[PDB]
Structure formats: C-alpha cells, structure tokens
Amino acid sequence: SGFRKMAFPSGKVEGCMVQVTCGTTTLNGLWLDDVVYCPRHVICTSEDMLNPNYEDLLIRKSNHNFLVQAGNVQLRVIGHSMQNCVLKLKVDTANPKTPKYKFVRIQPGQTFSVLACYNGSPSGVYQCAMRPNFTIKGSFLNGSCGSVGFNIDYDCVSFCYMHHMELPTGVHAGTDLEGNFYGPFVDRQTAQAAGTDTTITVNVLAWLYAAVINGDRWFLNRFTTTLNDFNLVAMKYNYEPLTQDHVDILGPLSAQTGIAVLDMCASLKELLQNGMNGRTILGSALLEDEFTPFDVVRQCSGVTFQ
Amino acid sequence: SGFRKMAFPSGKVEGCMVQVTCGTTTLNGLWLDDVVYCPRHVICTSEDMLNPNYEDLLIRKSNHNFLVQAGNVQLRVIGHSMQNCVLKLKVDTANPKTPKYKFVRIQPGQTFSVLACYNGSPSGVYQCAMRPNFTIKGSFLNGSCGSVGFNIDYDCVSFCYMHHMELPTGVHAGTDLEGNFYGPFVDRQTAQAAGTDTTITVNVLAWLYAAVINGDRWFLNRFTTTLNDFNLVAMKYNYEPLTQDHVDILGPLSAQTGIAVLDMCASLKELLQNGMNGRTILGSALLEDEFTPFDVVRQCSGVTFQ
Ligand SMILES: *c1ncc([N+](=O)[O-])s1
Ligand SMILES: *c1ncc([N+](=O)[O-])s1
Ligand SMILES: *c1ncc([N+](=O)[O-])s1
Ligand SMILES: *c1ncc([N+](=O)[O-])s1
Numbered sequence A, B: 001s002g003f004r005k006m007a008f009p010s011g012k013v014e015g016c017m018v019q020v021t022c023g024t025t026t027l028n029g030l031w032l033d034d035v036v037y038c039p040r041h042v043i044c045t046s047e048d049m050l051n052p053n054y055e056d057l058l059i060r061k062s063n064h065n066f067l068v069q070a071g072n073v074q075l076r077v078i079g080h081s082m083q084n085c086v087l088k089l090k091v092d093t094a095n096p097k098t099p100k101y102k103f104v105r106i107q108p109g110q111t112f113s114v115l116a117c118y119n120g121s122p123s124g125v126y127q128c129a130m131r132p133n134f135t136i137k138g139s140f141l142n143g144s145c146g147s148v149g150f151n152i153d154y155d156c157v158s159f160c161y162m163h164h165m166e167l168p169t170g171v172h173a174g175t176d177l178e179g180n181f182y183g184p185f186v187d188r189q190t191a192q193a194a195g196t197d198t199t200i201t202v203n204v205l206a207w208l209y210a211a212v213i214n215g216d217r218w219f220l221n222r223f224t225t226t227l228n229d230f231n232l233v234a235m236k237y238n239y240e241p242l243t244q245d246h247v248d249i250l251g252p253l254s255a256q257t258g259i260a261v262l263d264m265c266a267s268l269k270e271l272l273q274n275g276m277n278g279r280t281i282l283g284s285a286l287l288e289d290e291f292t293p294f295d296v297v298r299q300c301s302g303v304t305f306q
C-alpha cells in the first residue's frame, strides 16, 4: 500500500564519489577502477569559460596540477585525457569499492536517481526524469558539478548522467558518462535556454494505473477511444503522442487491473478536458509524469537489488 | 536552483540490513555491533496473532529456531531477549559496517528517510513525515516489516522508526528502535484505525519560504496578521496551531528572505481562503507540508555528511 517517488539505494554510488581540485575550481568526480571521471570545466579558471579551447588549455596542465581527494586520502594523478566534455584522470589506485557498472545513455521520458554531492561528499538522493527537451528538473547549488545519475538492476549500476550546469529557468543540463551532452547545450556560458517541453503521456497513463492498483477508481469512465482520437485531444494539451509500442508496454498494467489501455486513455482525455474538480490522485492535484510503466511494476512488486 | 523531496544517502543503513526467518515468517532486521533488531511479530506464525502472548511464545523458542542471513552469509544466534515490541537477537558476529548511531524518537511534524527492504535486500529510498496522528504515508508491501527510518548528521545515523504494519486506509504504523509504538497502535490484528489528521502549519510556511528563495513570489501580499488572528483562520482549515517557538525557528528563513514570519502567515491565510487560482508553487498544486524549516535550510545550503 502507498505509492511514492522512490530513488534507488545509493550506497554503491557513494563509495565512488571523490573531490577534484585544479586551480581555484573544485567539483565532484567519479572513481571507478583506476580512472576518475569529472567535468572538463575543472581546467577552466575565472578567465577561461567565455570561449574556451579545452584541448589548448589541457596540454598546458601538469598531472600534479590535479588534486584528487577520496575522503581524507589523497590520490595521485598519473595520467589524463579528455573525452568529449568529460576528463578521465588516471590515478595510481584502483577503487576497492567499484561496483559492477555500465555507461548507458537514456531516452527522454526515462527516469533515474541523482546523488547530489558537494566537495566529493554526498548530500541527498532523489528521483528525476529526462524531460522531452533533454533538461532535468533537479536540485543543484554551486559546487554540485560532477554529481551523477544512475539506475540499478540486480547488482549492476548503469550510470546515465553527469551534472554540468544550470539554465536560466532553473532547470539543469548535463552529459552521459562518455561526455556527450543531453540536448543542444554546451559547457560554456552562452545565452542557451531550455526550449519548449511537453508532458510524457505514457508515464501519466502508468501513474493512473498505479492509482487503480492502489484503490483510486474515481476517474474511470464508461467510454473508450481510438488511438487517433486520443492523440488528437492529446496534442491539444501539450502532451507527447502515444504509439502502439507505448500501448504494448502498458500491457502488463492493463492485464493486472483489467482496464484496457484505450479505456484508460478515455479517462485521461476526460481529466484533460475537465480538470480534477477539487479531487486528488495519489496525493497530487496535478497529472504526474515522472513514473515509467516499469517504475510502477517495480514498486508494486517489491523488486530488490544486490 | 530547484527544490526536491530529498532523502539522505542510504549507504550507511544498507550495510546494516539482514534477513530474519522463524517458522514460516520472514522479515527484515537491523544488525548493529553484535545485535540484530527486528519486529517481535517474527515469532508469530499463522495462528499466533489474534491475541498473542509474546513472552509465553518466546520462552518456547530455541536460538536455532532463528535463521539470520547477512547476504549469502549465515549468522548464528547465541541469545535473544524481547524489548517492548522489538526482538534483540544476539549474534556471534559484530557487523564490521556498523556506523556511528543513536536511537532517537521523533516528534510529529519531523521528517526522515525510509529504506524499504524485502528479505534483507534494499528496494528504494524515500522521505516521509510523522503525521500529527502518528502514522506515516509510506510505500510498503508484504515482507517490508522491519525496514527502518532514519536521519543523518555529519557521520551519525539517528534511527527513529521501524516499520510494523498497514492500517485500513493504506497508511503505516511502526515503533521507535526501543520497540515503543508511535501512536495508539498494537502489533496484533485488531480493528485499529488511523484517526483524524491535521496539516503541519510550520512546515507549510517553511516551504513557502523555499519557494521565495527559489524565485516564486506570486503569492505574497501587502497584509500582515497577528498570531491569534492567524490561528483562528488556521483552525478553520484543519491546520495545526502555530506557536511562538514555531515563529522563532522560522527566523533564519525570514531573515534570509526579508519577509517577516507574520507577513508570510498573511500569505498562507489568503491561499487557504482563495485557493491557488490555477497556479502552482514548486511544481505543486497543493500546499505541501513534509519539509521542515531545517530541511529547507539544509537543502538550500548544500550541507553534506561523512
Ligand atoms: C503498487 N501500488 C500499490 C500496491 N498495493 O498492493 O497496495 S502495489
Ligand atoms: C552488470 N553486470 C555485469 C557487468 N559487466 O561489466 O560485466 S555490469
Ligand atoms: C560544472 N560546473 C560548471 C560548469 N560550466 O560548464 O560552467 S560544468
Ligand atoms: C534553496 N532553494 C533554492 C536555492 N537557490 O539558490 O536556487 S537554495
């Protein structure tokens, strides 16, 4: 009973966080095996970010310019190389706490856990989604650059996000762990901005199914809809189009509840056209879109990790 | 920038979770030093919960009746004793991962992180508040009995909650780590029920200050109020009374924003009397009450733990 925005347990990632300092810049890095990954912005100092040439900045740097601290232990840097927008700092010490891991890039609409960190020290953990416009609505202060996002499956940590910056609306932009930005953003200070977003339709439907599993039925109705007639109405309220593949992945939740996917779409259509009339769903007065179909199944089943 | 419901990093608690099995009952336990703490309900089996005498049930039990598993390692039980509604299982092995810890009981209105677990394996982490009626609005399935709630300060883990049961409205009841229930609940199957709740007024005000720190100002107004005139209006919408001590602890947030506490109360009064008129605050269409004044300061400052 109950349904909560739930993050993955963070212990496996906590044991990988370190502090990187170069010049007058300090940020967070990620220590796996004998490599420390961090944002390349660390080689910039208070004159080197309007239009930096990082290749030119990096070849001027000596290994000893890089202070890496793992707790109160100093790690010695023995090599460095730049891969897109991340640095790879080769250290003389392999992290004995390295979990099984993968570097994966996620799709907009997919969710993950963020471990927010300052000076290599973990501050909090929370769940995020990749918006359709490739930003994320996080919580990040000065110093949090280099904090990572991730998913866990059995014993494997799939790292998907490294934090780099704040956009002028208060949302956040970052890279995958190969250093490639999500969306049309750069690791400079330009006038770049988020650009328009949409609501993640398949996730809203997953959350409506969660509400039914949990005992809410008030929003159901007698009607059905075709997939075309739904998307027509859905485009009108700034919702992403729904595909047959989306219908297919909502199949398990449909079979568990006995509500055909297209009947749930009829519910959503009425909720979009009429509002909630002072009611709530799962403690929310807004249609929530940061739970995937898989999150709902995972939470409602009790799946664990080792 | 941004403001999120953030849980504490969970690694220190993950390394304390184990599985306890007795008869046909399996649940979660908490291994600190050479003691495993778990709900005493584990000595019940499918006939021993309508009106159990646990003292009488426990003296019939042999140490070898208790299977404790820490990962794929079996811990041998060498003693047992009952303390209120928890068991203390003395094992022959001290947990090398025992953090610095305290057992503390929290007040209604205070927040904490829950690490939901099944079979000794962590599933997810999320933030909760102790409601005024001593329940918590969690997310818990069959098998989650024995999961704990906690806070962290620097390097100290203050354990405050052990989960025991679900109430018929879908909310949850449990004990502190000395085995004393929060609120008027028992670890039997009776007809017990939650009883009426209220909204945590001081926390709503803290969250309004968070919104101002974050850039929302739309809900502010020109008016002020006395503390009496506010509580009059506040009682009317099922909100807890606000005290001078509450006013005092909101002082830091008032000084950071330049908005006197009683001017913020005037804002809340108007929001209670008029609604939001289709607007939102920090991505919510409801007045949120699960952030304490201290949570806001902690998040907006970047405080970390080691
Ligand atoms: C997923 N949401 C609610 C469940 N329940 O069984 O109470 S499972
Ligand atoms: C998760 N399982 C195995 C991995 N590997 O790199 O082998 S990651
Ligand atoms: C990490 N902190 C700041 C960055 N920037 O590109 O400005 S990256
Ligand atoms: C706490 N909430 C928002 C902050 N900010 O500085 O953007 S601090």
Ligand SMILES: *c1ncc([N+](=O)[O-])s1
Residues within 6 Å of the ligand: B100, B101, B102, B155, B156, B157
């Ligand atoms: C947090 N700091 C010290 C503790 N102790 O039991 O000594 S708990």
Ligand SMILES: *c1ncc([N+](=O)[O-])s1
Residues within 6 Å of the ligand: B027, B039, B041, B049, B145, B146, B163, B164, B165, B186, B187, B188, B189
């Ligand atoms: C832990 N699981 C069930 C309990 N009960 O008192 O029924 S305690």
